[PDB]
Amino acid sequence: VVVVAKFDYVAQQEQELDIKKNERLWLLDDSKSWWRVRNSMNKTGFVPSNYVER
Amino acid sequence: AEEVVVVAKFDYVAQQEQELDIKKNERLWLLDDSKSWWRVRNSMNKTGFVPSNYVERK
């Protein structure tokens, strides 16, 4: 699935991707949602949203 | 402030440095809550995460 950047996104962490408006992007996992989480040793990263519950 | 404690349903093995290894039943803090991210690749074959509202299927 090719998608298109609607707007500029300036990465606010080294863990995010910078994209330019109109940029052609390849959407990689059947458009699955990821969430950003932090563990008890203060490490942060993305996990697929379906792997956690409140 | 907007950080809720969530529990891992399953083990997850990180496939990129920006992802996080987690264990089933591990307690984690969910950040930027409401914020759904998509894993994308650009024309320079860099893969990374962007907020879902910044992209669309045309």
Author numbering:
A (entry chain A): 3 to 56
B (entry chain B): 0 to 57
Please give me the paper's original passages concerning this structure.
During our studies, it became clear that Nck-SH3.1 exhibits conformational diversity and can swap half the number of its residues to form a dimer.
The swaps are located at the exact same position in all structures (i.e. Lys-36 in the n-Src loop), clearly visible based on the high-resolution electron density. Dimers are formed by exchange of the C-terminal 25 residues, almost half of the entire SH3 domain. The interface thus generated contains a short anti-parallel β-sheet encompassing the CD3ϵ sequence 36KSWW39. Superposition of the Nck1-SH3.1 structure with the bound CD3ϵ peptide shows that domain swap and tight peptide binding are mutually exclusive. The C-terminal half of the SH3.1-binding sequence would get into steric conflict with the second SH3.1 domain in the dimer. The hinge at Lys-36 provides quite a bit of flexibility that allows the dimer to pack in many different crystal lattices. Indeed, the hinge region varies over ∼6 Å within the superposed ensemble, and the distal loop covers a distance of ∼8 Å in the dimers. Given the large number of swapped, independent chains present in different crystal forms and grown under different conditions, swapping seems an intrinsic property of this SH3 domain.
